[PDB]
Amino acid sequence: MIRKIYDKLVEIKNQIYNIANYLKQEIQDKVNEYWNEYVINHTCKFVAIDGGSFGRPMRIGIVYAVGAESVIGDNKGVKTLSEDGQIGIFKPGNDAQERISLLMEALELSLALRDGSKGDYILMDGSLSKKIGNKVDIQQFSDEELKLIRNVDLNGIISIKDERKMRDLLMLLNQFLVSKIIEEYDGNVLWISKVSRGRDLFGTDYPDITVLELFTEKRGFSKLIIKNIPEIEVLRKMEYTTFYTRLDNGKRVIRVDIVGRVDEKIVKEIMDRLSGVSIKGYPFPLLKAHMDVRFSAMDREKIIKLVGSKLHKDIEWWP
Amino acid sequence: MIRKIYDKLVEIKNQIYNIANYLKQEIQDKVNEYWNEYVINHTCKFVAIDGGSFGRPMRIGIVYAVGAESVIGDNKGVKTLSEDGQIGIFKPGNDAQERISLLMEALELSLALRDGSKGDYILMDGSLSKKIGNKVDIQQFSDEELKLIRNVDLNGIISIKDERKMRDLLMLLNQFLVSKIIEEYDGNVLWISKVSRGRDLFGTDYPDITVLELFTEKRGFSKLIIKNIPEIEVLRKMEYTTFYTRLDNGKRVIRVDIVGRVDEKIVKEIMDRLSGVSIKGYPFPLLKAHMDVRFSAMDREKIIKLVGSKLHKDIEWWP
Ligand SMILES: [Mn+2]
Ligand SMILES: [Mn+2]
């Protein structure tokens, strides 16, 4: 780093005060209007799914690894149910990082169908909007390619020649997989995120979730927001509900999306139940799922070493 | 990481063999056709410029830091010339990482104008194509905004309200800055990259630069490729030359773009001169520039700590 930069900082006061003042005069009032304290709490099984992935640009191509885990938790305990993950190589390309992540999302969502029915609720890591992905051109696709979607053939989608088509087929797969989850599990799926760009509530330069963390402290929940978006088409008139909750005094606020109509009572029931498997304001089942699938710097080191050995072993003219 | 995933890898032979053969049967022949050995080498001043940056999503916004450095090097030595860098905060946004990087590119290119004339050649880190950026909508811009471009007012461009306009104004600034560099320094600018997606040469699934690293060992250079792309308009009929060179037996291949026509003799002169400030196949002036501007994990830690103190000190209601 440049020594000059850091000395100089020890300039930015202009932006700090601006943002502070703007925020104070924009919505110190409306926050408390739109927040509901819920301080009292009150046996219920959660299956949590999260995923991890990475890809490193190399000469043989983009060497990647994806993994997802389902985790069952209650009062009595947490244990892993399933693990699902592949290591592999993609050919060089502009959407390689995005294909890797979509492939990861694929495994998560498919574990939601595998083990979802083993609990009362399913906790996914990430928002409904983000898991669904953007709109996809359904016209570059032949009859055969649409089937891969229907039959949930990952090995097949991966085997595609073209790059744009692979990213796009994987996007479709995820939309079809969300759709199955929604129809099988109705309001029992909770899509939870620590981060969000939503402004439905306050309509400011900053996101709502940040607004609530600045101007409320106590355990609670926000005004409910009602949002909209083959079988995929049955997801076009899905209306869902968003709220923001803090499960524990002084801790982070999270976003929850639940497909269906939901009321105060349901929200308080969902908070009370989540609080029983939560640590420091967040559901342990998820934190665990997340921690297990993460690829440490060390994990990455191991993987590359392995792959580079199988190169140097199989191929003789390789440097 | 999921134990299962790594056990399993200790599957992928399918892809490793497939790639290997394809590559062997695609161009083990054409490589040597298109590679020129140049094993013999033969006082010349290089100014290198590189840049570093980062931004961390936080509640106050995206806290970022950019920095660029010019470095003068020859036979006798290397020393830093200028350092140029800012710390700041952006409002939350979808193009915040891109604005940060474009802001970084701005400082690099402006140091190329500052200190470029102090050397015989100027080494930039990165390709011509990438530094120029994509095409920009010149119609959302008023007269006032186009002037900020013309006067090189970073403080002004940063102060804009709207996000799409800021990214787009910064893109323009870079195009205008490259354009000044090209006209003041003609073929004296060498745009060097370790990575590239070019396929002009071999037209394969893998990039050319990877093809040459696999199938040649010795110091040399490739067939020359001739490519195309207010003052920016004077950059639309810029034709430039690309070649790939390895400066040192057994080492990496780099891409060089130089604006102008260039021949074998020039290429061999440029290799010979670069070899004299190069270590293990790469020009030390750049490596140094790059190392100095890099933001270590530790650098990032310090910066955040500082910023978070200036919040908690200035703002009282801040958590
Ligand atoms: Mn995740
Ligand atoms: Mn750089």
> Which one, of B200, B197, B249, B261, lies nearest residue B220 by Cα?
B249
Minimum CA–CA partner of A92 in chain B: B206
Quick check: A43 contacting B, CB < 8 Å? no
3-state secondary structure of A100: helix
Q: Is A225 helix (H, G, I), strand (E, B) or coil?
A: strand
Judged by DSSP in three states, A233 sits in helix
SS3 assignment, position A12: coil
Q: Roughly how many angstroms between the first and final C-alpha of chain B, as a whole number?
A: 34
Query: Quick check: A215 and A25 in contact, CB under 8 A?
Result: no
State the distance from the centre of ligand 1 to the C-alpha of A193, rounded, in angstroms: 9
Nearest to B122 by CA among B249, B240, B283: B283
Q: Would you state the structure tokens that stand for residue B176, as one six-digit string?
A: 């205008």
The distance of B295 to chain A (nearest Cα, Å) reads 5
3 state DSSP class of A193: strand
* Bridge pairing between strands A220-222 and A189-193: unpaired
First to last CA, chain A: 34
A10/B contact by beta carbon, under 8 A = yes
A 67-86 residues inside an 8 A Cβ radius of B: 67, 69, 83, 85-86
Angle at A138 between CA A85 and CA A131, to 5 degrees: 40
Query: For residues B93 and B183, what is the distance between their CA atoms, to the nearest angstrom?
Result: 35
Residues of chain A contacting residue B4, judged by C-beta atoms under 8 Å apart:
83, 85
Which ranges in A253-319 belong to alpha helices (H)?
264-275, 284-293, 297-314
Ligand nearest to the CA of B192: 2
Does residue A89 sit in helix, strand or coil? Answer: strand
> How many angstroms separate the CA atoms of A117 and B231, rounded?
64
Enumerate the residues of chain A whose CB falls inside 8 A of the CB of residue B18. Answer: none
Report d(CA A115, CA A107) in Å as an integer. 12
Residue B167 identity: R
**B236 CB contacts (<8 Å, ≥6 apart)?**
B229
Please check whether residue A56 touches B, CB under 8 A.
Answer: no
- Interface contact A317-B13, CB threshold 8 A: no
Q: Please report residues of B whose CB lies closer than 8 A to that of A92.
A: 197, 205-207, 210
Ligand 2 centre distance from Cα of residue B41 (Å): 28
A256 to each of A49, A187, A267, A319, how far by Cα in Å?
A: 15, 12, 10, 51
SS3 A73: strand
Q: Strand (E) positions, A74-134?
A: 78-90, 121-125
Question: What part of A 236-295 touches B (C-beta under 8 Å)?
Answer: 292-295
User: How far is residue B72's CA from residue B85's CA, in Å, rounded to a whole number?
Assistant: 18
> Would you call A89 and B319 a contact, using CB atoms and an 8 Å cutoff?
no
Helix axes A143-151, A163-185, angle to 10 degrees: 40
User: Inter-chain contact A2–B214, Cβ cutoff 8 Å?
Assistant: no
B-chain CB neighbours of A85 within 8 Å are 2, 4-5
- Ligand showing the shortest atom-to-Cα distance for residue B107: 2
Could you count the other beta carbons within 10 Å of the beta carbon of residue A229?
14
What pairing do the DSSP bridges indicate for beta strands B220-222 and B35-37? antiparallel
CA distance A281 to A246: 7
Nearest by Cα to B293 from B57, B126, B85? B85
Question: Considering only CB atoms, which chain B residues are within 8 Å of A32?
Answer: none
Distance B253 CA to ligand 2 centre (A): 17
Q: State which residue of chain B sits closest to A308, comparing Cα positions.
A: B16
What crossing angle do the helices spanning A163-185 and A96-115 adopt, rounded to 10°?
20
Asked if residues B241 and B262 have their Cβ atoms less than 8 Å apart, the reply is yes
SS3 for A216?
coil
In b/e form, how buried is each residue of B196-222, taking b as 16+ CB within 10 angstroms?
A: bebeebbebbbbbbbbbbbbbeebbbb
| Residue type at position A202 | F
How does A189-219 read in b/e, with b if 16+ C-beta sit within 10 Å?
bbbbbeebebeebbebbbbbbbbbbbbbeeb
Q: Which residue has the tokens 């056709």?
A: B33
- Cβ pair B60:A16 closer than 8 A: yes
Contact A1 B87 (CB under 8 A): no
Beta strands A46-57 and A121-125 are parallel
User: Which ligand gives the minimal distance to the CA of A101?
Assistant: 1
Q: B78 pairs with which residues across the strands?
A: B73
**DSSP type of residue A91:** P
Q: What is the DSSP string of chain B?
A: --HHHHHHH---HHHHHHHHHHHHHHHHHHHHHHEEE--------EEEEEEEEEEEE-SS-EEEEEEEEEEEEETTEEEEEEEEEEEEEEPS-TTHHHHHHHHHHHHHHHHHHHHGGGSSEEEEES-HHHHH-S---TTS--HHHHHHHHHT-HHHHHT-S-HHHHHHHHHHHHHHHHHHHHHHHGGGEEEEES-----TTT-SSS-HHHHHHHH--SSEEE--EEEE---GGGGTT-EEEEEEEESSTTS--EEEEEES---HHHHHHHHHHHHTTEETTEEHHHHHHHHHH---HHHHHHHHHHHHHHHHHH-SS--
User: Residues A264, A270, A271, A276: what is their CA dihedral angle, to the nearest 10 degrees?
Assistant: 150
Ligand positioned closest to the Cα atom of A130: 1
Tokens of B76: 């006798």
CA dihedral over B97, A304, A313, A319, signed as positive or negative? positive
Q: Is the dihedral of CA A118, A122, A128, A130 positive or negative?
A: negative
- Gap between the Cα atoms of B243 and B225, Å rounded: 6
**A86, A95, A178, B315 from A52: Cα distances, Å:** 11, 18, 18, 37
Q: How far apart are CA B281 and CA B245, in angstroms?
A: 9
Structure determination technique employed: X-ray
Output the CA B287–ligand 1 centroid distance in Å.
35
CA-nearest residue to B318 within chain A is: A214
Kindly identify the ligand whose nearest atom is closest to the C-alpha of A125: 1
Residue in chain A lying closest to B10 (CA):
A306
Nearest Cα to Cα of residue B35 among B215, B255, B258, B170: B215
Question: What whole-number distance in Å separates Cα of residue B65 and Cα of residue B106?
Answer: 13
Is residue B205 a contact partner of residue B22, using CB atoms and an 8 Å limit? yes
- Spacing of C-alpha B18 from chain mean position: 32
Query: By CB neighbour count within 10 A (0-12 exposed, 13-18 middle, 19+ buried), where does A220 fall?
Result: buried
Q: Is A8 on the interface with B (CB under 8 A)?
A: yes
Burial of B240 (0-12, 13-18, 19+ CB in 10 A): buried
Could you tell me the CA-to-CA distances from A116 to A47, A130, A185, A232 in Å, in that order? 6, 20, 8, 20
Residue A131 to residue A255: CA distance in whole angstroms: 14
Give binding residues of A for Mn(2+) as ranges.
50, 125
What value does the CA radius of gyration of chain A take, rounded to a whole number of Å? Answer: 22
Residues in chain B closer than 8 A to A65 (CB atoms): 1, 5
Instruction: Give the separation between CA A19 and CA A16, rounded to whole angstroms.
Output: 5
On chain A, the residues whose CB falls within 8 A of the CB of B59 are 210, 213-214
A6 at interface of B, judged by CB pairs closer than 8 A: yes
